[PDB]
Structure 1
Amino acid sequence: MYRLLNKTAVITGGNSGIGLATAKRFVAEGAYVFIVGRRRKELEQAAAEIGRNVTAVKADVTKLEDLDRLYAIVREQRGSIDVLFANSGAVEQKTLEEITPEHYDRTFDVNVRGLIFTVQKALPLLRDGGSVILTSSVAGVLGLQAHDTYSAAKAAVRSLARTWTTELKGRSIRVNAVSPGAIDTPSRAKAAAATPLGRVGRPEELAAAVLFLASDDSSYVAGIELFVDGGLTQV
Structure 2
Amino acid sequence: MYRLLNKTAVITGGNSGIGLATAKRFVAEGAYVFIVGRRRKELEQAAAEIGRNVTAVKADVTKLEDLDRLYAIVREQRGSIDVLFANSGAIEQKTLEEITPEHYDRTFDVNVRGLIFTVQKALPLLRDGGSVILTSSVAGVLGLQAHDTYSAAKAAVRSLARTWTTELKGRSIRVNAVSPGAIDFAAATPLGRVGRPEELAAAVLFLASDDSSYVAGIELFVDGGLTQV
Q: CA deviation at 1:164?
A: 0.1
What SS is found at the alignment partner of 2:168?
helix
Question: Alignment length, in residue pairs?
Answer: 228
Deviation string 1:186-218 (CA, Å, 9 cap, x unpaired) is xxxxxx101000000000000000000000000
Is 1:121–2:135 an aligned residue pair? no
Q: CA deviation at 1:122?
A: 0.1
What SS is found at the alignment partner of 1:103?
helix
Q: CA deviation at 1:15?
A: 2.7
Unmatched tracts of structure 2, length 5 or more:
none
Residue in structure 2 matched with residue 197 of structure 1 by the alignment: 191
CA distance, structure 2, for counterparts of residue 183 and residue 163 of structure 1: 27
CA distance, structure 2, for counterparts of residue 179 and residue 38 of structure 1: 23
What SS is found at the alignment partner of 2:214?
coil
Q: CA deviation at 1:99?
A: 0.3
CA distance, structure 1, for counterparts of residue 88 and residue 23 of structure 2: 13
What SS is found at the alignment partner of 1:52?
coil
* Conserved? CA contact 1:59–1:67, under 8 Å: yes
Residue in structure 1 matched with residue 203 of structure 2 by the alignment: 209
Q: CA deviation at 1:16?
A: 3.0
CA distance, structure 2, for counterparts of residue 220 and residue 80 of structure 1: 22
What SS is found at the alignment partner of 1:3?
coil
CA distance, structure 2, for counterparts of residue 176 and residue 92 of structure 1: 25
Q: CA deviation at 1:141?
A: 0.2
What SS is found at the alignment partner of 1:56?
strand
What SS is found at the alignment partner of 1:178?
strand
Residue in structure 2 matched with residue 45 of structure 1 by the alignment: 45
Q: CA deviation at 1:88?
A: 1.4
CA distance, structure 1, for counterparts of residue 43 and residue 156 of structure 2: 28
What SS is found at the alignment partner of 1:92?
coil
Calculate the TM-score normalised by the size of structure 1. Answer: 0.96
CA distance, structure 1, for counterparts of residue 67 and residue 92 of structure 2: 24
* Conserved? CA contact 1:16–1:46, under 8 Å: no
What SS is found at the alignment partner of 1:182?
coil
The share of aligned pairs that are identical, in percent, is 100
Residue in structure 1 matched with residue 226 of structure 2 by the alignment: 232
Deviation string 1:24-49 (CA, Å, 9 cap, x unpaired) is 00000000000000011000000011
Runs of 4+ in 1 over 3 A off after TM superposition: none
* Conserved? CA contact 1:132–1:214, under 8 Å: yes
Q: CA deviation at 1:14?
A: 1.1
CA distance, structure 1, for counterparts of residue 76 and residue 26 of structure 2: 21
Calculate the TM-score normalised by the size of structure 2. Answer: 0.99
